[model samples]
Target: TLRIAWWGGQPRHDYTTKVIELYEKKNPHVHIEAEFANWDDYWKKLAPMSAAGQLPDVIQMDTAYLAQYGKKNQLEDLTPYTKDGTIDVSSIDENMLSGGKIDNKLYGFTLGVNVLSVIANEDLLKKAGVSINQENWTWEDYEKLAYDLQEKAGVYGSNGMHPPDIFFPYYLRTKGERFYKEDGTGLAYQDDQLFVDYFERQLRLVKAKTSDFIVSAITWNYSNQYLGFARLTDSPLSLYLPPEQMQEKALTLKPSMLFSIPKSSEHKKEAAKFINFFVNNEEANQLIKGERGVPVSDKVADAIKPKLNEEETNIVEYVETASKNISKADPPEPVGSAEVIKLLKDTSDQILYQKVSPEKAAKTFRKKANEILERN
Candidate 1:
């Protein structure tokens, strides 16, 4: 019996269940039990389970938890499986495989690849008399469009924009700074100036009435329905699904969610079999339909393409184009790094909400963050 834990909304749950059923059919001897949550609660439950040595047999892990699990010797080394041919990567793109490696070992496989993109509501943009093109859009353009939409369209310009984890890395990349030092012991930014800049932008949007905050902080994660543009119900890029899933599920590809079996799994052989089947099987990919992100396998992508409707095909093309620019989403940070991220988030909130000046917060965060990292 394999107990698998995952986090997703209803649509995700339904599709995953269907895929599991298919897996069961293919291997009659396997009994699979699934445990799920929306998001917030998923980690809440998972962390304790991990600490207590009660983790599920098969766990759906992400980059956020990879470091903690891997460094602590909690995850199983999957190198043997991949090397001995139990897990096939020859058909998977080299780029897709790139993000899952930690210190030269493949710890997890990405469900798909995605990038952080601006999700504009075309109707609102038109009403605001603002236009956006991928080549020309800037953060300033986003602010202008949001303000105009709020004043003219009578709707919020964007959903409550939070500071995304990718923004730090993106900003650093733009300025030729690394998000982490080579030693992985500290941040790459000189101070919290980058984070302040990012959050200040979100704050400006909120103040302009183009976005909102705390829509109803439910303990669990909700889909885009809880977001601003999501409420508009008219935007092309709203949630995490691919463009092809717009009608079926109103989301656009962002960062790809990840999947990996910990090296600690007692059933390593069976785990590898499941990973191969999950990505390569025709029926599983069909049900998935590139909904999560673009299918990683070329064969699966092509087989599923003919079945996609026009709208879906457009999404596929969009993702394929975006794939060319998809930078490497680095794996999890070192052990104390998780706390550093939280400190950045919380301290930035202080600056944004006026609890401290940006300059002060910058100094304070850098000092404290460095201290925390050094202690680790």
Candidate 2:
């Protein structure tokens, strides 16, 4: 018997469980047990399972924890499976397949990919007397638009998109720096001043009452951000690319997440086979249908295109529209990366809440994050 685990909301579990049933129908001898949870509870449960040596066969993985898990030898290297055609890549994007590789080993196979987009309420943009200029815009252009939205549109301009690990690294990239060193041993950007500049711009918007000040708003950069935008004007949306001159460096098609097998699973090759069917099978794609983001397999992606509603089609199309403007993504984050993200949020909270200065927070983050990175 093979066991699998994942983290998601209700709809995710719904389709996933149905897919499991379908898998079982196709292979009567291979019964699979499915375990799922919310994002917050997923790792909390997975941590102990790994500690007790009882992890599920196939597990969902993300950049933050993939390194740590692989380093612990808890994740199966799927390189041989991919090499031997047990996990077929014939229909998958060539570049995307290697996204899950580390040190020449494949620990996870990406499920899908997405670009970071600023989905805006176009009605609100026109109301504010400003619109995106994707070819040539600056951070100054963005800062000005926030206040314009507040004063003219009479609403919060944005939900303050400032995650130190996710968004900030793009800002670092725009400045020709990286968030972590190439080898994942330490922080890459030399100047702490960039940290101050990025967050300070947001604080200005918050203090001006032009944008959200809550920490949750910091995560409003992706899928939830699009839903949040819907409420601003009841659904007149447009994609907002990052400030344009720096677009090539700042933007990327990041993998939504990856699928990996845990080393403890006796059914390693079977798990690999399942992942192949999971990603490339057209019938399964009909159900999953880019729920995880756009599927990485071209054949499956094409097969599922007719199934998308107008709204859903635009997002998948937008990722394609954005392809010309992006660069190679940063290497997978290091083992201590999650801790660094927490450190960033804590420091950002202190700065935003007026309990500390951005400069001081920068100093503290650099020290704490470096120490975490160096040791891990």
Candidate 3:
């Protein structure tokens, strides 16, 4: 018997359960149990399991938590399985496979890839008398586009921007810096200017009154609602990469999630076989339809490409385009990184609320973040 756990929405849970059923049907002797929850509950459940050394046999993992678990020696090293053909890798790109590697060991297998993307509503752009040339647009161009849309269409420009922790790290990447050092000891970027510039630009958007900080706080579902009914177009949503940065190693295709075998699992072989089935099964991929980002297997991706709906097709096309120009993804976040991320979010809120200047915020954030990283 094998136990598998993951975090996702109802649609993901439903399809994944079907996939598990298919796997079990094919191997009649193996009985698999499925465990799942919403994101928060999933992590909360895993915490006690992890502490008690009773983690699920197969677990869905994320980059943020990958390093923390891997470094604790709680994740199984999957290299031997891949090498021995238990988990097929021939059709997956090498870069895709490496996303789950830490300390030169394969602790997880990337299930799919997704880039940060700006989703646009063409109808709203048409109403605003502007069309985005995503190929040539600079950050300055983006701001201008947002302001123009507001002036011409009486709508909020972009969907504001991503939180500081998410967007600031990408901003650092564009400038050839990383969010954390290779050893995960502390912040990788030494220049505080990068932090200041990022926050100031966000401040500019807020000051222009083209973005609503409150509205930006809504879920993506609600943001889409605004796009459908409230005419919010040309918002600065985070997408893969702007054109100018694509060729310069600034853009990267990151894994959306990963699957791992716990070190404590008794059914390691079964877990690996299940991963193989998930990646290569044509029937299962059909059910998945790229909901978990773009499929990692080239064969599965190609097989599902023609079957995708409009939205899924867009994601597939975007990932395909991004694949041509992306550099290797940065290593997973460090153990204390989650705490540092929260600190950044808190400091960023202070900046947006005008409680602190960008420079002061940057200084304070760096000081506090480094302290957390070093202590961990």
List TM-score per model, in order.
Answer: 0.80, 0.91, 0.90
Give the alpha-carbon lDDT of every model.
0.64, 0.77, 0.76
Q: What is the lDDT ranking, best to worst?
A: 2, 3, 1
In candidate 3, which residue ranges exceed 4 Å CA deviation? 212-244
Model 2 C-alpha lDDT per residue in residues 183-205, reported as the tens digit of each score: 78889887989889988886887
Per-residue lDDT of model 1, residues 35-93, tens digit only: 99988989998888776777776777776667676666677766677678887776777
List candidate 1 segments past 4 Å from native.
52-54, 164-166, 191-206, 209-255, 309-315
Question: Which residue pairs come into collision in candidate 1?
Answer: 75-263, 75-264, 76-262, 76-263, 76-264, 77-263, 159-228
Error of 3 at 19 (Å): 0.6
lDDT of 3 at 368: 80
Model 3 over residues 1-376: C-alpha lDDT tens digits?
Answer: 8999999889889999999999889999999999999999999999888868889988999888888888678899998998999988899888887778888888888888877655555555667787656555666777777787777766677666666676687678777787777667788898899899888888888777567432221211211122222234333332324424543556666778889988999899989999999888889999987877788889999999999865566567777877886777867777888799889888887998866988878878888888888965
Evaluate model 3: give its lDDT. Answer: 0.76
Determine which window of 10 residues in candidate 1 has minimal summed lDDT: 213-222
Q: Candidate 1 local accuracy as lDDT?
A: 0.64
- Candidate 3 C-alpha error for residue 5, in Å: 1.1
